Design a protein around this nucleic acid. Structure first.
Lengths: 277, 299
RNA sequence: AAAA
Protein backbone atom coordinates (compact mmCIF):
# COMPACT_ATOMS: atom_id res chain seq x y z
CA UNK A 1 0.00 0.00 0.00
CA UNK A 2 1.41 3.35 -1.13
CA UNK A 3 0.94 5.77 1.77
CA UNK A 4 4.36 7.43 2.26
CA UNK A 5 4.12 9.58 -0.87
CA UNK A 6 4.63 13.28 -0.09
CA UNK A 7 5.57 15.08 -3.31
CA UNK A 8 3.39 14.67 -6.39
CA UNK A 9 6.54 14.28 -8.51
CA UNK A 10 7.59 11.29 -6.39
CA UNK A 11 4.67 9.25 -7.73
CA UNK A 12 5.52 10.22 -11.32
CA UNK A 13 9.17 9.25 -10.84
CA UNK A 14 8.20 5.99 -9.14
CA UNK A 15 5.67 5.03 -11.83
CA UNK A 16 7.28 6.32 -15.06
CA UNK A 17 10.94 5.36 -14.64
CA UNK A 18 13.05 2.88 -16.58
CA UNK A 19 15.31 1.58 -13.78
CA UNK A 20 14.26 1.02 -10.16
CA UNK A 21 17.30 0.81 -7.83
CA UNK A 22 17.43 -1.84 -5.10
CA UNK A 23 20.31 -1.27 -2.65
CA UNK A 24 21.52 -4.57 -1.20
CA UNK A 25 23.94 -5.02 1.70
CA UNK A 26 26.04 -8.01 2.79
CA UNK A 27 26.18 -7.79 6.59
CA UNK A 28 27.07 -10.57 9.02
CA UNK A 29 20.88 -2.92 14.57
CA UNK A 30 23.91 -2.18 12.41
CA UNK A 31 21.86 -3.01 9.30
CA UNK A 32 19.59 -0.05 10.07
CA UNK A 33 22.63 2.24 10.19
CA UNK A 34 24.01 0.61 7.03
CA UNK A 35 20.70 0.72 5.16
CA UNK A 36 20.19 4.37 6.15
CA UNK A 37 23.53 5.24 4.54
CA UNK A 38 22.69 3.07 1.53
CA UNK A 39 19.32 4.79 1.18
CA UNK A 40 21.08 8.17 1.29
CA UNK A 41 23.65 7.25 -1.37
CA UNK A 42 20.98 6.21 -3.87
CA UNK A 43 19.06 9.35 -2.84
CA UNK A 44 21.97 11.37 -4.25
CA UNK A 45 21.16 10.08 -7.74
CA UNK A 46 17.46 9.27 -7.16
CA UNK A 47 15.90 11.82 -4.79
CA UNK A 48 12.54 10.08 -5.38
CA UNK A 49 13.75 6.86 -3.73
CA UNK A 50 12.64 5.78 -0.26
CA UNK A 51 12.68 2.44 1.53
CA UNK A 52 9.04 2.85 2.60
CA UNK A 53 8.06 3.79 -0.95
CA UNK A 54 9.99 0.77 -2.25
CA UNK A 55 8.23 -1.60 0.16
CA UNK A 56 4.89 -0.03 -0.81
CA UNK A 57 5.43 -0.23 -4.58
CA UNK A 58 7.12 -3.64 -4.82
CA UNK A 59 7.18 -5.27 -1.37
CA UNK A 60 10.98 -5.37 -1.16
CA UNK A 61 11.35 -5.06 2.61
CA UNK A 62 14.52 -4.05 4.43
CA UNK A 63 15.14 -7.66 5.48
CA UNK A 64 14.45 -8.63 1.84
CA UNK A 65 17.61 -6.77 0.71
CA UNK A 66 20.11 -8.11 3.26
CA UNK A 67 21.44 -11.55 4.19
CA UNK A 68 22.12 -11.52 7.94
CA UNK A 69 21.89 -13.85 10.92
CA UNK A 70 37.89 -21.01 9.83
CA UNK A 71 35.22 -20.08 7.29
CA UNK A 72 33.32 -23.24 6.51
CA UNK A 73 29.97 -24.94 5.85
CA UNK A 74 28.44 -21.92 7.60
CA UNK A 75 29.85 -19.63 4.89
CA UNK A 76 28.69 -21.81 2.02
CA UNK A 77 25.29 -22.29 3.68
CA UNK A 78 24.76 -18.55 4.07
CA UNK A 79 25.85 -18.22 0.43
CA UNK A 80 23.33 -20.74 -0.89
CA UNK A 81 20.47 -19.99 1.53
CA UNK A 82 19.48 -16.49 0.38
CA UNK A 83 22.19 -14.96 -1.83
CA UNK A 84 21.79 -17.54 -4.62
CA UNK A 85 18.15 -16.68 -5.33
CA UNK A 86 17.97 -13.11 -3.97
CA UNK A 87 18.77 -11.29 -7.21
CA UNK A 88 16.56 -13.61 -9.27
CA UNK A 89 13.60 -13.16 -6.91
CA UNK A 90 13.98 -9.38 -6.69
CA UNK A 91 14.31 -9.03 -10.46
CA UNK A 92 11.22 -11.23 -10.78
CA UNK A 93 9.33 -8.91 -8.42
CA UNK A 94 10.09 -5.79 -10.50
CA UNK A 95 9.46 -7.58 -13.78
CA UNK A 96 8.69 -4.81 -16.37
CA UNK A 97 11.43 -2.29 -15.62
CA UNK A 98 15.17 -2.83 -15.60
CA UNK A 99 17.10 -3.01 -12.33
CA UNK A 100 20.11 -0.95 -11.23
CA UNK A 101 21.58 -2.68 -8.19
CA UNK A 102 23.54 -0.81 -5.52
CA UNK A 103 25.84 -3.16 -3.63
CA UNK A 104 27.84 -2.82 -0.42
CA UNK A 105 29.44 -5.66 1.52
CA UNK A 106 31.40 -6.53 4.64
CA UNK A 107 33.35 -9.80 4.30
CA UNK A 108 36.11 -9.64 1.69
CA UNK A 109 36.47 -13.36 0.98
CA UNK A 110 32.71 -13.98 0.98
CA UNK A 111 32.32 -11.02 -1.38
CA UNK A 112 34.11 -13.01 -4.09
CA UNK A 113 31.52 -15.78 -3.89
CA UNK A 114 28.73 -13.21 -3.64
CA UNK A 115 29.97 -11.56 -6.83
CA UNK A 116 30.44 -14.87 -8.63
CA UNK A 117 26.85 -15.82 -7.82
CA UNK A 118 25.85 -12.23 -8.65
CA UNK A 119 27.16 -12.44 -12.22
CA UNK A 120 28.74 -10.21 -14.83
CA UNK A 121 25.49 -9.52 -16.49
CA UNK A 122 24.02 -7.24 -13.80
CA UNK A 123 24.01 -3.46 -14.19
CA UNK A 124 25.47 -2.63 -10.79
CA UNK A 125 26.91 0.24 -8.78
CA UNK A 126 29.37 -1.03 -6.18
CA UNK A 127 29.69 1.50 -3.36
CA UNK A 128 32.53 1.77 -0.84
CA UNK A 129 29.39 8.19 4.07
CA UNK A 130 29.36 5.52 1.37
CA UNK A 131 30.93 6.45 -1.98
CA UNK A 132 30.24 4.72 -5.29
CA UNK A 133 33.49 3.34 -6.68
CA UNK A 134 32.49 0.79 -9.34
CA UNK A 135 30.24 2.05 -12.15
CA UNK A 136 29.01 -0.76 -14.41
CA UNK A 137 26.02 0.97 -16.00
CA UNK A 138 25.26 3.64 -18.57
CA UNK A 139 30.61 1.34 -20.35
CA UNK A 140 30.02 -1.78 -18.27
CA UNK A 141 31.63 -4.18 -20.77
CA UNK A 142 35.03 -2.52 -20.15
CA UNK A 143 35.17 -4.52 -16.90
CA UNK A 144 36.32 -7.55 -18.92
CA UNK A 145 38.98 -5.71 -20.94
CA UNK A 146 42.10 -7.89 -20.87
CA UNK A 147 43.91 -5.90 -23.57
CA UNK A 148 46.37 -4.10 -21.28
CA UNK A 149 49.74 -5.84 -21.62
CA UNK A 150 52.37 -6.17 -18.90
CA UNK A 151 54.48 -3.33 -20.32
CA UNK A 152 51.71 -0.71 -20.16
CA UNK A 153 50.72 -1.31 -16.53
CA UNK A 154 49.89 1.88 -14.63
CA UNK A 155 48.32 1.07 -11.25
CA UNK A 156 49.57 -2.38 -10.21
CA UNK A 157 52.45 -4.76 -10.93
CA UNK A 158 52.04 -8.46 -11.71
CA UNK A 159 54.72 -11.10 -11.18
CA UNK A 160 54.36 -14.78 -12.09
CA UNK A 161 56.64 -17.31 -10.38
CA UNK A 162 56.57 -20.92 -11.60
CA UNK A 163 58.71 -23.66 -10.06
CA UNK A 164 56.77 -26.79 -11.13
CA UNK A 165 55.75 -26.50 -14.80
CA UNK A 166 54.30 -30.02 -14.70
CA UNK A 167 52.16 -29.29 -11.63
CA UNK A 168 49.09 -27.27 -12.68
CA UNK A 169 48.38 -25.63 -9.31
CA UNK A 170 48.89 -21.85 -9.14
CA UNK A 171 48.44 -19.59 -6.12
CA UNK A 172 46.73 -16.20 -6.42
CA UNK A 173 48.10 -13.31 -4.34
CA UNK A 174 46.60 -9.81 -4.58
CA UNK A 175 48.42 -7.44 -2.21
CA UNK A 176 45.87 -4.62 -2.33
CA UNK A 177 44.79 -4.19 1.28
CA UNK A 178 46.16 -3.46 4.76
CA UNK A 179 48.55 -6.26 5.80
CA UNK A 180 50.78 -7.89 3.20
CA UNK A 181 49.96 -11.64 3.04
CA UNK A 182 52.85 -12.55 0.71
CA UNK A 183 55.03 -14.38 3.23
CA UNK A 184 52.15 -16.12 4.98
CA UNK A 185 50.62 -17.16 1.64
CA UNK A 186 53.96 -18.50 0.41
CA UNK A 187 54.41 -20.50 3.62
CA UNK A 188 50.86 -21.86 3.41
CA UNK A 189 51.20 -22.88 -0.24
CA UNK A 190 54.65 -24.43 0.31
CA UNK A 191 53.63 -26.18 3.55
CA UNK A 192 50.03 -27.43 3.28
CA UNK A 193 49.15 -27.73 -0.42
CA UNK A 194 52.83 -28.09 -1.47
CA UNK A 195 52.23 -25.55 -4.25
CA UNK A 196 55.32 -23.73 -5.53
CA UNK A 197 53.42 -21.62 -8.09
CA UNK A 198 52.12 -18.17 -7.15
CA UNK A 199 50.57 -15.33 -9.17
CA UNK A 200 51.28 -12.29 -6.99
CA UNK A 201 49.64 -8.95 -7.78
CA UNK A 202 51.02 -5.95 -5.91
CA UNK A 203 50.47 -2.21 -6.08
CA UNK A 204 52.88 -0.12 -8.13
CA UNK A 205 52.90 2.58 -5.42
CA UNK A 206 45.14 2.84 0.00
CA UNK A 207 43.44 3.66 -3.29
CA UNK A 208 41.71 6.77 -4.63
CA UNK A 209 38.12 6.24 -3.50
CA UNK A 210 36.78 9.14 -5.58
CA UNK A 211 38.27 7.84 -8.83
CA UNK A 212 36.75 5.00 -10.84
CA UNK A 213 38.20 1.60 -9.93
CA UNK A 214 37.70 -0.10 -13.31
CA UNK A 215 41.42 -0.03 -14.36
CA UNK A 216 42.32 -2.17 -11.33
CA UNK A 217 39.86 -4.86 -12.43
CA UNK A 218 41.04 -4.60 -16.04
CA UNK A 219 44.69 -4.97 -14.99
CA UNK A 220 44.08 -7.98 -12.72
CA UNK A 221 41.97 -9.68 -15.41
CA UNK A 222 44.64 -9.01 -18.05
CA UNK A 223 47.42 -10.31 -15.79
CA UNK A 224 45.47 -13.49 -15.04
CA UNK A 225 44.77 -14.10 -18.73
CA UNK A 226 48.41 -13.40 -19.64
CA UNK A 227 49.51 -15.95 -17.03
CA UNK A 228 46.97 -18.47 -18.35
CA UNK A 229 47.93 -17.85 -22.00
CA UNK A 230 51.18 -19.83 -22.08
CA UNK A 231 50.68 -22.39 -19.29
CA UNK A 232 47.94 -24.72 -18.07
CA UNK A 233 46.50 -24.48 -14.55
CA UNK A 234 44.07 -27.00 -13.09
CA UNK A 235 43.27 -25.15 -9.85
CA UNK A 236 43.77 -21.64 -8.44
CA UNK A 237 43.70 -20.60 -4.76
CA UNK A 238 43.48 -16.96 -3.72
CA UNK A 239 45.51 -15.57 -0.83
CA UNK A 240 44.91 -11.84 -0.78
CA UNK A 241 43.74 -8.72 1.00
CA UNK A 242 41.45 -6.36 -0.90
CA UNK A 243 38.58 -3.91 -0.45
CA UNK A 244 35.04 -5.22 -0.71
CA UNK A 245 34.54 -3.51 -4.08
CA UNK A 246 37.71 -4.91 -5.65
CA UNK A 247 37.11 -8.56 -4.74
CA UNK A 248 33.39 -8.20 -5.48
CA UNK A 249 34.16 -6.95 -8.98
CA UNK A 250 36.81 -9.65 -9.43
CA UNK A 251 34.20 -12.28 -8.63
CA UNK A 252 31.84 -10.55 -11.05
CA UNK A 253 34.42 -10.58 -13.85
CA UNK A 254 36.18 -13.94 -13.42
CA UNK A 255 32.93 -15.61 -12.42
CA UNK A 256 32.35 -19.33 -12.02
CA UNK A 257 34.21 -20.42 -15.16
CA UNK A 258 37.68 -20.79 -13.70
CA UNK A 259 38.25 -23.56 -11.14
CA UNK A 260 38.94 -21.44 -8.05
CA UNK A 261 39.00 -22.29 -4.33
CA UNK A 262 38.40 -19.07 -2.40
CA UNK A 263 39.87 -19.06 1.11
CA UNK A 264 39.40 -16.61 3.98
CA UNK A 265 42.20 -15.31 6.20
CA UNK A 266 41.76 -13.88 9.69
CA UNK A 267 39.58 -23.32 1.17
CA UNK A 268 36.01 -22.33 2.01
CA UNK A 269 33.94 -22.50 -1.17
CA UNK A 270 34.63 -23.17 -4.85
CA UNK A 271 33.91 -20.60 -7.55
CA UNK A 272 32.88 -23.31 -10.01
CA UNK A 273 30.61 -24.69 -7.27
CA UNK A 274 28.54 -21.50 -6.92
CA UNK A 275 26.45 -22.63 -9.89
CA UNK A 276 26.52 -26.14 -8.37
CA UNK A 277 25.66 -25.12 -4.79
CA UNK B 1 -7.94 -15.67 -32.40
CA UNK B 2 -6.79 -12.09 -31.85
CA UNK B 3 -7.66 -11.26 -28.24
CA UNK B 4 -4.57 -9.57 -26.72
CA UNK B 5 -4.42 -6.68 -29.22
CA UNK B 6 -5.82 -3.20 -28.59
CA UNK B 7 -4.80 -0.83 -31.38
CA UNK B 8 -5.29 -1.38 -35.12
CA UNK B 9 -1.87 -0.19 -36.34
CA UNK B 10 -0.25 -3.34 -34.96
CA UNK B 11 -2.99 -5.49 -36.52
CA UNK B 12 -2.58 -3.99 -39.99
CA UNK B 13 1.23 -3.98 -39.72
CA UNK B 14 1.24 -7.69 -38.89
CA UNK B 15 -1.29 -8.39 -41.65
CA UNK B 16 0.46 -6.50 -44.44
CA UNK B 17 4.18 -7.12 -43.89
CA UNK B 18 6.77 -9.35 -45.54
CA UNK B 19 9.24 -10.08 -42.71
CA UNK B 20 8.04 -11.55 -39.40
CA UNK B 21 10.58 -11.70 -36.54
CA UNK B 22 10.85 -15.07 -34.79
CA UNK B 23 13.22 -14.26 -31.91
CA UNK B 24 14.76 -17.56 -30.83
CA UNK B 25 16.89 -17.84 -27.69
CA UNK B 26 18.74 -20.60 -25.85
CA UNK B 27 18.90 -20.90 -22.06
CA UNK B 28 19.92 -23.50 -19.47
CA UNK B 29 18.55 -22.93 -15.97
CA UNK B 30 15.31 -21.83 -14.32
CA UNK B 31 12.12 -20.83 -16.13
CA UNK B 32 11.87 -17.42 -14.43
CA UNK B 33 15.20 -16.30 -15.87
CA UNK B 34 14.04 -17.68 -19.21
CA UNK B 35 10.94 -15.48 -19.01
CA UNK B 36 13.11 -12.46 -18.15
CA UNK B 37 15.46 -13.16 -21.07
CA UNK B 38 12.52 -13.56 -23.44
CA UNK B 39 11.06 -10.27 -22.17
CA UNK B 40 14.35 -8.45 -22.83
CA UNK B 41 14.53 -10.01 -26.30
CA UNK B 42 10.92 -8.98 -26.97
CA UNK B 43 11.79 -5.41 -25.99
CA UNK B 44 14.77 -5.49 -28.37
CA UNK B 45 12.60 -6.76 -31.24
CA UNK B 46 9.91 -4.16 -30.50
CA UNK B 47 12.64 -1.53 -30.75
CA UNK B 48 12.78 -2.44 -34.46
CA UNK B 49 9.28 -3.89 -35.06
CA UNK B 50 6.98 -2.07 -32.64
CA UNK B 51 3.99 -4.26 -33.51
CA UNK B 52 5.77 -7.40 -32.27
CA UNK B 53 4.61 -9.15 -29.11
CA UNK B 54 4.66 -12.66 -27.68
CA UNK B 55 0.90 -12.52 -27.16
CA UNK B 56 0.42 -11.40 -30.77
CA UNK B 57 2.72 -14.21 -31.93
CA UNK B 58 0.63 -16.76 -30.01
CA UNK B 59 -2.62 -15.24 -31.28
CA UNK B 60 -1.42 -15.20 -34.90
CA UNK B 61 0.49 -18.48 -35.40
CA UNK B 62 -0.41 -20.36 -32.20
CA UNK B 63 3.24 -20.36 -31.13
CA UNK B 64 4.20 -19.94 -27.48
CA UNK B 65 7.38 -18.87 -25.69
CA UNK B 66 8.50 -22.50 -25.48
CA UNK B 67 9.02 -22.79 -29.25
CA UNK B 68 11.18 -19.64 -29.22
CA UNK B 69 13.35 -21.03 -26.40
CA UNK B 70 16.03 -23.73 -26.54
CA UNK B 71 15.45 -24.41 -22.85
CA UNK B 72 17.02 -27.01 -20.61
CA UNK B 73 16.56 -27.52 -16.89
CA UNK B 74 19.70 -27.05 -14.82
CA UNK B 75 23.32 -27.41 -15.83
CA UNK B 76 23.85 -29.51 -18.94
CA UNK B 77 25.60 -32.81 -18.12
CA UNK B 78 29.20 -32.91 -19.32
CA UNK B 79 28.65 -35.81 -21.70
CA UNK B 80 28.99 -35.79 -25.47
CA UNK B 81 25.83 -37.87 -25.92
CA UNK B 82 23.84 -35.44 -23.75
CA UNK B 83 24.87 -32.47 -25.90
CA UNK B 84 24.16 -34.47 -29.06
CA UNK B 85 20.71 -35.34 -27.71
CA UNK B 86 20.10 -31.66 -26.99
CA UNK B 87 21.21 -30.70 -30.52
CA UNK B 88 19.09 -33.40 -32.16
CA UNK B 89 15.85 -33.47 -30.15
CA UNK B 90 15.59 -29.67 -29.90
CA UNK B 91 17.79 -27.73 -32.32
CA UNK B 92 17.85 -30.08 -35.33
CA UNK B 93 14.24 -29.42 -36.36
CA UNK B 94 13.41 -26.25 -34.39
CA UNK B 95 14.26 -23.75 -37.13
CA UNK B 96 12.69 -25.93 -39.83
CA UNK B 97 9.44 -26.17 -37.85
CA UNK B 98 9.44 -22.43 -37.13
CA UNK B 99 10.03 -21.69 -40.83
CA UNK B 100 7.15 -24.02 -41.73
CA UNK B 101 4.91 -22.35 -39.13
CA UNK B 102 4.94 -19.08 -41.10
CA UNK B 103 5.08 -20.14 -44.75
CA UNK B 104 3.90 -17.13 -46.84
CA UNK B 105 5.81 -14.52 -44.82
CA UNK B 106 9.59 -14.38 -44.51
CA UNK B 107 11.07 -14.91 -41.04
CA UNK B 108 13.73 -12.68 -39.47
CA UNK B 109 15.48 -14.56 -36.67
CA UNK B 110 16.48 -12.31 -33.77
CA UNK B 111 18.89 -14.74 -32.13
CA UNK B 112 20.82 -14.72 -28.87
CA UNK B 113 22.12 -17.64 -26.82
CA UNK B 114 23.74 -18.61 -23.53
CA UNK B 115 26.30 -21.42 -23.95
CA UNK B 116 29.00 -20.18 -26.32
CA UNK B 117 30.11 -23.65 -27.45
CA UNK B 118 26.54 -24.62 -28.36
CA UNK B 119 26.24 -21.63 -30.70
CA UNK B 120 28.57 -23.24 -33.23
CA UNK B 121 26.17 -26.17 -33.49
CA UNK B 122 23.20 -23.79 -33.60
CA UNK B 123 24.82 -21.91 -36.49
CA UNK B 124 25.71 -25.16 -38.27
CA UNK B 125 22.11 -26.37 -38.02
CA UNK B 126 20.93 -22.85 -38.91
CA UNK B 127 22.56 -22.38 -42.31
CA UNK B 128 23.48 -19.31 -44.32
CA UNK B 129 20.17 -19.60 -46.23
CA UNK B 130 18.37 -17.68 -43.45
CA UNK B 131 18.53 -13.91 -43.05
CA UNK B 132 19.14 -13.28 -39.36
CA UNK B 133 19.93 -10.56 -36.84
CA UNK B 134 22.36 -11.93 -34.25
CA UNK B 135 22.27 -9.94 -31.00
CA UNK B 136 24.47 -9.56 -27.94
CA UNK B 137 23.48 -8.08 -24.58
CA UNK B 138 25.25 -4.86 -23.70
CA UNK B 139 25.30 -4.89 -19.91
CA UNK B 140 25.61 -1.13 -19.40
CA UNK B 141 21.89 -0.66 -20.09
CA UNK B 142 20.80 -4.34 -20.12
CA UNK B 143 19.68 -4.37 -23.73
CA UNK B 144 20.54 -6.34 -26.84
CA UNK B 145 22.46 -4.87 -29.76
CA UNK B 146 22.24 -6.12 -33.33
CA UNK B 147 25.88 -7.09 -33.89
CA UNK B 148 25.22 -9.20 -37.00
CA UNK B 149 22.80 -8.19 -39.76
CA UNK B 150 22.23 -10.69 -42.57
CA UNK B 151 18.91 -9.32 -43.85
CA UNK B 152 24.42 -12.21 -46.28
CA UNK B 153 27.02 -12.65 -49.03
CA UNK B 154 29.55 -10.62 -47.03
CA UNK B 155 29.06 -13.29 -44.37
CA UNK B 156 30.96 -15.74 -46.60
CA UNK B 157 33.54 -13.30 -47.95
CA UNK B 158 37.19 -14.25 -48.34
CA UNK B 159 38.89 -11.37 -50.23
CA UNK B 160 40.47 -9.95 -47.05
CA UNK B 161 44.13 -10.98 -46.84
CA UNK B 162 46.47 -11.19 -43.86
CA UNK B 163 48.28 -7.94 -44.68
CA UNK B 164 44.91 -6.14 -44.63
CA UNK B 165 43.85 -7.48 -41.22
CA UNK B 166 42.40 -4.80 -38.96
CA UNK B 167 40.45 -6.48 -36.15
CA UNK B 168 41.87 -9.94 -35.40
CA UNK B 169 45.39 -11.32 -35.41
CA UNK B 170 45.86 -14.87 -36.69
CA UNK B 171 48.87 -17.18 -36.60
CA UNK B 172 49.44 -20.68 -37.96
CA UNK B 173 51.95 -22.97 -36.25
CA UNK B 174 52.92 -25.97 -38.39
CA UNK B 175 55.51 -28.02 -36.51
CA UNK B 176 54.50 -31.44 -37.90
CA UNK B 177 53.64 -31.06 -41.61
CA UNK B 178 53.27 -34.84 -42.01
CA UNK B 179 50.35 -35.03 -39.56
CA UNK B 180 47.19 -33.80 -41.29
CA UNK B 181 45.43 -32.52 -38.16
CA UNK B 182 45.48 -29.15 -36.40
CA UNK B 183 43.71 -27.37 -33.56
CA UNK B 184 41.60 -24.27 -34.14
CA UNK B 185 41.94 -21.98 -31.11
CA UNK B 186 39.96 -18.73 -30.82
CA UNK B 187 40.35 -16.17 -28.03
CA UNK B 188 37.99 -13.22 -28.42
CA UNK B 189 36.46 -13.34 -24.92
CA UNK B 190 37.83 -12.54 -21.48
CA UNK B 191 39.24 -15.93 -20.37
CA UNK B 192 42.31 -17.16 -22.22
CA UNK B 193 41.91 -20.75 -23.50
CA UNK B 194 45.25 -20.91 -25.37
CA UNK B 195 47.27 -22.65 -22.66
CA UNK B 196 44.60 -25.12 -21.56
CA UNK B 197 43.57 -26.08 -25.10
CA UNK B 198 47.22 -26.38 -26.17
CA UNK B 199 47.87 -28.70 -23.22
CA UNK B 200 44.75 -30.70 -24.13
CA UNK B 201 45.88 -31.05 -27.75
CA UNK B 202 49.48 -31.96 -26.90
CA UNK B 203 48.54 -34.33 -24.05
CA UNK B 204 45.29 -35.84 -25.26
CA UNK B 205 45.21 -35.42 -29.02
CA UNK B 206 48.97 -35.36 -29.83
CA UNK B 207 48.54 -32.38 -32.17
CA UNK B 208 51.21 -29.71 -32.60
CA UNK B 209 49.74 -27.63 -35.45
CA UNK B 210 47.56 -24.73 -34.32
CA UNK B 211 45.55 -21.82 -35.73
CA UNK B 212 45.54 -19.11 -33.05
CA UNK B 213 43.10 -16.21 -33.40
CA UNK B 214 43.01 -13.25 -30.99
CA UNK B 215 42.11 -9.57 -31.14
CA UNK B 216 44.53 -6.94 -32.42
CA UNK B 217 44.14 -4.09 -29.92
CA UNK B 218 41.16 -4.43 -27.53
CA UNK B 219 41.03 -8.05 -26.41
CA UNK B 220 38.06 -8.96 -24.25
CA UNK B 221 35.90 -5.98 -25.24
CA UNK B 222 34.28 -5.51 -28.65
CA UNK B 223 32.09 -2.50 -29.44
CA UNK B 224 28.58 -3.94 -29.30
CA UNK B 225 27.23 -0.94 -31.21
CA UNK B 226 29.61 -1.50 -34.13
CA UNK B 227 29.11 -4.32 -36.62
CA UNK B 228 31.03 -7.50 -35.80
CA UNK B 229 30.75 -8.81 -39.38
CA UNK B 230 34.38 -7.76 -40.13
CA UNK B 231 35.55 -9.93 -37.20
CA UNK B 232 34.03 -13.05 -38.73
CA UNK B 233 35.24 -12.02 -42.19
CA UNK B 234 38.83 -11.93 -40.91
CA UNK B 235 38.39 -15.21 -39.02
CA UNK B 236 36.92 -17.04 -42.03
CA UNK B 237 39.59 -15.66 -44.37
CA UNK B 238 42.29 -16.89 -41.98
CA UNK B 239 40.64 -20.31 -41.72
CA UNK B 240 40.32 -20.72 -45.49
CA UNK B 241 43.86 -19.44 -46.10
CA UNK B 242 45.08 -22.08 -43.64
CA UNK B 243 43.20 -24.68 -45.73
CA UNK B 244 44.47 -23.43 -49.11
CA UNK B 245 48.15 -24.44 -49.00
CA UNK B 246 47.45 -27.32 -46.59
CA UNK B 247 45.05 -30.24 -46.41
CA UNK B 248 43.53 -30.76 -42.96
CA UNK B 249 41.72 -34.06 -42.50
CA UNK B 250 40.36 -33.00 -39.11
CA UNK B 251 40.19 -29.76 -37.12
CA UNK B 252 39.71 -29.26 -33.37
CA UNK B 253 37.92 -26.11 -32.19
CA UNK B 254 38.42 -24.47 -28.79
CA UNK B 255 37.13 -20.95 -28.27
CA UNK B 256 36.45 -18.20 -25.75
CA UNK B 257 34.30 -16.11 -28.09
CA UNK B 258 31.10 -14.08 -27.77
CA UNK B 259 27.82 -15.96 -28.13
CA UNK B 260 26.97 -13.79 -31.13
CA UNK B 261 30.40 -14.40 -32.64
CA UNK B 262 30.13 -18.13 -31.93
CA UNK B 263 26.79 -18.41 -33.73
CA UNK B 264 28.06 -16.27 -36.62
CA UNK B 265 31.12 -18.51 -36.94
CA UNK B 266 28.88 -21.58 -36.86
CA UNK B 267 26.62 -20.28 -39.61
CA UNK B 268 29.62 -19.18 -41.71
CA UNK B 269 31.49 -22.49 -41.38
CA UNK B 270 28.37 -24.65 -41.36
CA UNK B 271 28.75 -28.40 -41.69
CA UNK B 272 31.10 -28.19 -44.71
CA UNK B 273 34.24 -28.65 -42.61
CA UNK B 274 35.78 -31.47 -40.52
CA UNK B 275 35.82 -29.81 -37.08
CA UNK B 276 35.12 -31.25 -33.63
CA UNK B 277 34.15 -28.60 -31.07
CA UNK B 278 35.45 -29.02 -27.52
CA UNK B 279 33.48 -27.47 -24.67
CA UNK B 280 35.05 -26.25 -21.43
CA UNK B 281 32.82 -27.07 -18.45
CA UNK B 282 33.40 -25.05 -15.30
CA UNK B 283 32.08 -27.60 -12.77
CA UNK B 284 34.01 -30.55 -14.20
CA UNK B 285 37.04 -32.52 -13.07
CA UNK B 286 40.20 -32.43 -15.15
CA UNK B 287 40.26 -32.73 -18.12
CA UNK B 288 37.61 -30.01 -18.49
CA UNK B 289 37.47 -30.25 -22.30
CA UNK B 290 35.37 -32.78 -24.18
CA UNK B 291 34.41 -33.25 -27.82
CA UNK B 292 30.72 -32.44 -27.43
CA UNK B 293 30.05 -32.74 -31.17
CA UNK B 294 31.65 -32.58 -34.60
CA UNK B 295 30.69 -29.95 -37.16
CA UNK B 296 30.77 -32.43 -40.06
CA UNK B 297 28.45 -34.97 -38.38
CA UNK B 298 25.39 -32.70 -38.01
CA UNK B 299 23.47 -33.94 -41.06
C1' A C 1 34.68 -20.60 -22.51
C1' A C 2 26.92 -21.09 -19.21
C1' A C 3 23.93 -14.27 -22.91
C1' A C 4 32.26 -12.84 -23.81
Amino acid sequence: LVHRIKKIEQLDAWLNTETIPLPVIQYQNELKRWQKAMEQKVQEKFSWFSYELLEDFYGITNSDLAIFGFEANAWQKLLQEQVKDKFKLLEDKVMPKKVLWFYAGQISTLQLGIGALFGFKRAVSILQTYHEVFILYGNARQLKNVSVKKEDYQYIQSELLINEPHKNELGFIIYLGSHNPIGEAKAYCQKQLQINNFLIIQAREVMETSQNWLPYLQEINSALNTARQEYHWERIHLFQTAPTALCMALGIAVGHFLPVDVYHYQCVFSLDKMLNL
